[PDB]
Amino acid sequence: SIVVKNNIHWVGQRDWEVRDFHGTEYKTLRGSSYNSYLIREEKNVLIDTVKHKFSREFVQNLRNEIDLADIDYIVINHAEEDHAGALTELMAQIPDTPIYCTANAIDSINGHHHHPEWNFNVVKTGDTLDIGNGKQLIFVETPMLHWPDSMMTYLTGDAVLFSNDAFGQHYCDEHLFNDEVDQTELFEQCQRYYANILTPFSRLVTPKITEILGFNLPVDMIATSHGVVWRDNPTQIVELYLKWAADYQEDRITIFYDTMYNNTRMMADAIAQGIAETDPRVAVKIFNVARSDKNEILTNVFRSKGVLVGTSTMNNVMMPKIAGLVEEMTGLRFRNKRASAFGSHGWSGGAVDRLSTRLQDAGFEMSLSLKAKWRPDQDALKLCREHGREIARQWALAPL
Amino acid sequence: SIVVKNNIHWVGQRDWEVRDFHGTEYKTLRGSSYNSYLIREEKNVLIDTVKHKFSREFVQNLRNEIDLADIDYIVINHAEEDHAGALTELMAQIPDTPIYCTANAIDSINGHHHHPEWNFNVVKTGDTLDIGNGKQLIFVETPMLHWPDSMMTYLTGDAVLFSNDAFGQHYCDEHLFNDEVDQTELFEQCQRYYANILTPFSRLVTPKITEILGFNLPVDMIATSHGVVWRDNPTQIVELYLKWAADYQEDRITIFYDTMYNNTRMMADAIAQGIAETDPRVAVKIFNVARSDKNEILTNVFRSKGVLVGTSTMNNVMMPKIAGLVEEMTGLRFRNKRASAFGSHGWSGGAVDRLSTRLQDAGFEMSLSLKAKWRPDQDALKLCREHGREIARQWALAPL
Ligand SMILES: Cc1cc2nc3c(=O)[nH]c(=O)nc-3n(C[C@H](O)[C@H](O)[C@H](O)COP(=O)(O)O)c2cc1C
Ligand SMILES: Cc1cc2nc3c(=O)[nH]c(=O)nc-3n(C[C@H](O)[C@H](O)[C@H](O)COP(=O)(O)O)c2cc1C
Ligand SMILES: [Fe+3]
Ligand SMILES: [Fe+3]
Ligand SMILES: [Fe+3]
């Protein structure tokens, strides 16, 4: 194990090979980690666990650190499989150990493990737990961040905020602290995390952070359930969350599409040029949804002021990958963004209008659509380049 | 080149490496071919071409077979890129050569190539073209099979029906004739082709085949644009098309789903058991949409009497891959099929009802949904197994 601070010991699990989270909806390109902590004062407290597949390693490593019978309290900030998956394995050795968690946590913990006979202790915001030596744990309820059972645990004296998922990122490294890792790679994974997971709950992030800051509690470190431990200016990740939650957007336009014969692709490239030559301030990214990483697309959309989505008509409907991605954006609930649909068709078409409607349903302020028949000739590409001009002038953050 | 029959020479292109058709919406696991034919009587006629990427090889191989200036007529049964892609390359050497095709073909050919100065000859059903030696070509319009410009060309005397896409399949082999290849692999690719491409136009297949059979024209061979040439009982592929077009279905149920933590998967496996123990006559297939081949899924759905689609609730909506696949099935327009939605949720759910509605929009006759919270315990799995029982009894093709 690794010493986090004083009597705080990291007993989690690094996952270098992991590439798929939430099934296949979140690609972890730089691996991930599952942070579990063992506090050893007068009382011994285990905070969260690890993935189920590493349950055997978790219990064995935990034995080498401390006798399982000497563990007093178990804390579950979150009952998702990647944090409470090894719970059943552990409770088999110490079934009488009390479990501190939220009321919703009992529903989620029992929902996965089916061991309601366990000794649960429902906690709510303001509740405290003495561990001796003048130190105590303070619990803060954070429902829908990102789960109904989510909560944070604060350790007095050491000033360590166990935030679980919050302020975490999927980044695997042998070093434990934020000031010991690559800053660029760290920022990319942090932003990648919020944009794909916490975006729809942005309206709850600001008020909750304000509430926690209102407690006037000192924060020396922020120990999340994923990635590094924030010790050097740990409040920096909290500030980013404040910015990201405020309907974050840069002067950027993201264009993505699906194509069978590149007709729609040629439209996208023409649109980008029309934008770039109209507003040099705007950064432009283009992705083929079939050839690109879905999570990178969503991260840019989160950063963008507006997007253009392209699709060709296939059997009177839009292409499946485009339909699927739009369905996903509807769940993320992006705010204060604009959208414009485009694409090519053969005869009757109809996929472009279909897509435009669903983008509006997803919450985007819709501009006019751009349509073309078969492969665009020189005259058609002028219109597509013109469409980019019209979009750039409309979506301008400032004059000129 | 290879001799098909008498003065008919195959001048197409085999594609062993090809794995993606229509972008990435049709996986060609056994490669494919692009059949082009050169008829050499008193007149010389080229029927269709090949993919654009093989244009340089096509024109070069064609030169070795015949002088390009000695080619009298060019026939385009279909103006899709995989058949008329090398047209521009060829017309650059012989721009004065007449092109025979449908009225819609001119719109599609010009739409891709942008060379309207070419000498087009609009043809319609019943039109003939003399090539000498008592032989002539007969044109038959087949709109929406699968394109508005689609048509077939019949050669009298030799009794060869150039059907283009119709009765074709994506199967690459060094041997040219159907009686020279693996029959099982051939049938799989043929059924795979119709189910994924021609399903929505099934209402047009029967009447068109009836019309062609009404001409009382002899059929010795059927030369398609993809795969083998039917010479040994060539009308066998036509009979399959008659069966497949009549809202084809076996006593079979296809179950597919997407899952983040296998909760929905455990429901699917439980449902399958409940069905298998209720109706042994039914064949059952199960697929994870994230781990399976999309085209194999659609082929089974085409063969099935009904399907069960599973999804967990993710951000108040369904999983993208499931939403995307449902969008695709809506375009295929399956008929006389039944559907039942299921899936797991965390708290409020809603993805199951959402999916069930879209399945009904896709044309499926909807049965009751099956829902579960978190991971199903023993009592929950009984319900899922019970749901399979209720589905099996309802979807029974015959009593008991
Ligand atoms: C399988 C298939 C289905 C199609 N269905 C339609 C359709 O329903 N309506 C339409 O107007 N065009 C249809 N088309 C024509 C395409 O939309 C047309 O070729 C388009 O310009 C190509 O789009 P792309 O940018 O993806 O290459 C279809 C084409 C294919 C290959
Ligand atoms: C990222 C994420 C989002 C979720 N969103 C919802 C939701 O909006 N509504 C709900 O009832 N449950 C939600 N859940 C809980 C899951 O539906 C629950 O864990 C389910 O039982 C797992 O489904 P599975 O079969 O794919 O593993 C969510 C879970 C995750 C991981
Ligand atoms: Fe989580
Ligand atoms: Fe997590
Ligand atoms: Fe075609």
Ligand SMILES: [Fe+3]
């Ligand atoms: Fe084809």
Ligand SMILES: [O]
């Ligand atoms: O998590």
Ligand SMILES: [O]
């Ligand atoms: O085709």
